[model samples]
Target chain A: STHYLAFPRASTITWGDDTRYWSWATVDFCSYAIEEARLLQVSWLDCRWSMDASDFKQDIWYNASVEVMLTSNASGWNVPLHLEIELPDGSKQESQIVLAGRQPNVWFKIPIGKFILRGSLTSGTIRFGFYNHEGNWKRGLNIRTLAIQA
Target chain B: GQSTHYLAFPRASTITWGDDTRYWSWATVDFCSYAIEEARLLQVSWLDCRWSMDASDFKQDIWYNASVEVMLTSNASGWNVPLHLEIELPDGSKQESQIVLAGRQPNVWFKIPIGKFILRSGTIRFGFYNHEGNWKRGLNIRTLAIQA
Candidate 1:
């Protein structure tokens, strides 16, 4: 059953779920998915931040926080991540986020820190990835919810 | 209910998980696999990992490669995932092999071929973890299905 979704603005985006909202990266891929959830393989290339929200709104420096719900496969699996967002004004903003991995299947939320929206929340691209770490990485985690909180 | 078939994972049961409200845990994560059947399933390419267990502290007795395990409907529409298995023969014995679920190209019956065994009954397990102190390198599941 193929699906499609569109929203004006959302504080939370569910990835690896359906196509009603965000579309994933097809064609050349990196990570492997089972039952729809994408597992991290190596770097940012293994996963994806390939969805675009046509009318997403973000307030500049609104003390906004990008939070995610995820589970770690290992005990000390630490992820240095980068969240790239296209502002409502068309400019792009990148944030450095580091998350700690603890238990498996157990849901954990990391503020991942906050950033300034900088401009109005207009059409933008919100992507999540690794923090420029070389290969030979540790464990990877599953992302349940990726939200931009005010 | 032996003749009443339903869609599910190990033990032919639906997965039960919780969401992050005011608290959370890595050991009791709610995001395991997509429930929409095939929308964007939770795959395993690094180790022989399950949808639940933490990939960090696996039993330390297993080693898996790039592979995925998904339970398609008795009437799906595509080829099933490729799996490597070690099954206990109905002869009270065991056999290790690989299987590529290919038969109807797509269908139900929940009796697809995994690795080298026709997984229908017995004490069978779905099958590890990563190397880096980073255990978050596994799967990225969708929460929409749970809400749906």
Candidate 2:
């Protein structure tokens, strides 16, 4: 079936299972799906930050952290990444991220350390790029949810 | 009762994996079976490779070349064809791409090289997708055909 989805800015996603059996598995996991036909719902299924940082109303840094999975060892140091955060109020914050490589099927911990406390978590976007020492590369994408307003 | 989920997988095409290989294997997206039985569809690719990375403790990379031929039908409209990327590691394990979007063209080469030194083979696969709300995958794939 054909389908269209505009994420409503604040919500969790249930991307359909990975169906390599079908050709639509990649976009199923894309934050902004490029394929809209032979339609398959993918699960870039993840949590993110969605709050505004500057709109915190008060001044503080919130403790923020993120998790990323790496499948390639590109150059052994750098991987591409993205994320979002929500404030105490009704705003959102996004982060410029770097994804790192690890063993296959392994969940790596990415700690943003401490955040300068912001508004609240609203919506977020991210890209995952993998690398090999010999310059081999691969990337992934998703919409995440972030909350710092607690 | 037989459930409501229907499917239609594409038939596999005969590809010349080649007679020469130091190491070789392949993975294809030829939708063989699914929930329903329909025709209009898109093609996707898969991968597998049989390689020899003799440099132990060192990162030995093997780049394999893959080829394919795509024939479009009248129902072509949406998503074109998705180029799926996946891998089977040295330990007899599999790794796959998180997405399924690649450029549309017939007879192009897709490449993947494992960055280790203790593996024998990996399979690579691919196929097509159409716009008429149908996708029949796994068109034609060439064994990263390499000459050692």
Best by lDDT: 1
Q: After superposition, which runs of candidate 2 have C-alpha atoms over 4 Å from their true positions? A: A1-61, A72-79, A88-93, A100-106, A113-150, B1-148
User: Candidate 1 A-chain TM?
Assistant: 0.43
Give a tens-digit lDDT track for model 2, residues A44-115: 324322222222223444343433334333222253433444334423445544444445434344443333
Q: Taking the candidates in order, what DockQ does each have?
A: 0.02, 0.01
Over A89-127, each residue of candidate 1 has an lDDT whose tens digit, in order, gives 555556655555334565454433334443333333444
lDDT string for model 1 (B1-148, tens) is 0110011222111122212212111232222222222222222233233222112111123332212333433332222344444433334454455554445332322332223233221232333122222212122222111100
Report the lDDT of model 2 for residue B93.
53
What local lDDT does model 2 show for residue A103?
53
lDDT for position B39 in model 2: 23
Model 1 clash number:
62
Error (Å) of candidate 2 at residue B95 is: 46
lDDT of each: 0.30, 0.28
Candidate 1 structure, TM-score to reference: 0.30
